[PDB]
C-alpha cells in the first residue's frame, strides 16, 4: 500500500532518570550503548551532553 | 607516569596572599579536574573543593567559600590555589590532587604554609 504517506521524521529527546544515577556523592549519567545524552544540570557543569 | 608536583612552602605575615601552584604530569589535564585538600596540622583531612579544569568553573567546600580562589594555567598544565587575607590559622599544607576512578587516585607532595609575622 502506497496510496498515502505520512512524515516520519526523528523522534525528539526522552527522558530517562534510570541514567542518572549516583557516584557515591555526585549524579552518575550513563548511555544506552553509546547513544546521545544531553546533559548538565541546575548547577554549572558539564553543558552539552555529548558522551559516553 | 602521573606526577603532580606543588611550589615550595611559604613563609607570609598575617594579611598576606599566596597562590600555590600544581603543575600536572602524565595524563590530560582536561579530561580530570583538580581536589583541592588541607591537612591542618592536627585536625586531619579536609576537602576545599574541585575546578572543572575542562569549563574552568570551580566549587569550594562552604568552609572555603571567599579568601579562597581556584584557578588554573590551563595551558601549563597548572592549577593554583590561591589565598587571600592570610589568616594566622591558614598554616597548614594543602595537596592537589586527580578526581578520577569516583574518587581520587594521585595526590601531590603538599605546600606547607606558614602564617607568621
Known amino acids: 500500500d502506497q496510496g498515502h504517506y505520512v512524515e516520519m521524521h526523528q523522534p525528539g529527546l526522552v527522558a530517562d532518570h534510570s541514567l542518572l544515577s549516583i557516584h557515591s556523592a555526585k549524579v552518575k549519567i550513563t548511555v544506552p550503548s553509546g547513544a546521545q545524552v544531553k546533559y548538565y544540570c541546575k548547577c554549572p557543569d558539564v553543558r552539552e551532553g555529548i558522551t559516553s | 607516569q602521573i606526577q603532580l608536583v606543588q611550589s615550595g612552602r611559604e613563609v607570609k605575615n598575617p594579611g598576606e596572599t599566596v597562590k600555590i601552584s600544581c603543575k600536572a604530569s602524565?595524563?590530560?589535564?582536561?579530561?580530570?579536574?583538580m581536589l583541592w585538600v588541607k591537612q591542618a596540622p592536627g585536625k586531619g583531612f579536609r576537602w576545599m573543593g574541585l575546578?572543572?579544569?575542562?569549563?574552568?568553573?570551580?566549587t569550594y567546600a562552604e568552609e572555603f567559600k571567599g579568601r579562597f580562589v581556584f584557578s588554573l594555567e590551563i595551558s601549563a598544565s597548572t592549577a593554583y590555589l590561591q589565598i587571600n587575607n592570610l589568616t594566622n590559622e591558614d598554616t597548614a599544607t594543602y595537596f592537589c590532587?586527580?578526581?578520577?576512578?569516583?574518587?581520587?587516585?594521585?595526590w601531590g607532595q603538599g605546600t606547607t604554609l606558614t602564617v607568621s609575622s
Open positions: 602524565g595524563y590530560t589535564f582536561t579530561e580530570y579536574p
Open positions: 590532587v586527580r578526581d578520577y576512578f569516583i574518587s581520587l587516585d594521585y
Open positions: 575546578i572543572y579544569t575542562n569549563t574552568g568553573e570551580p
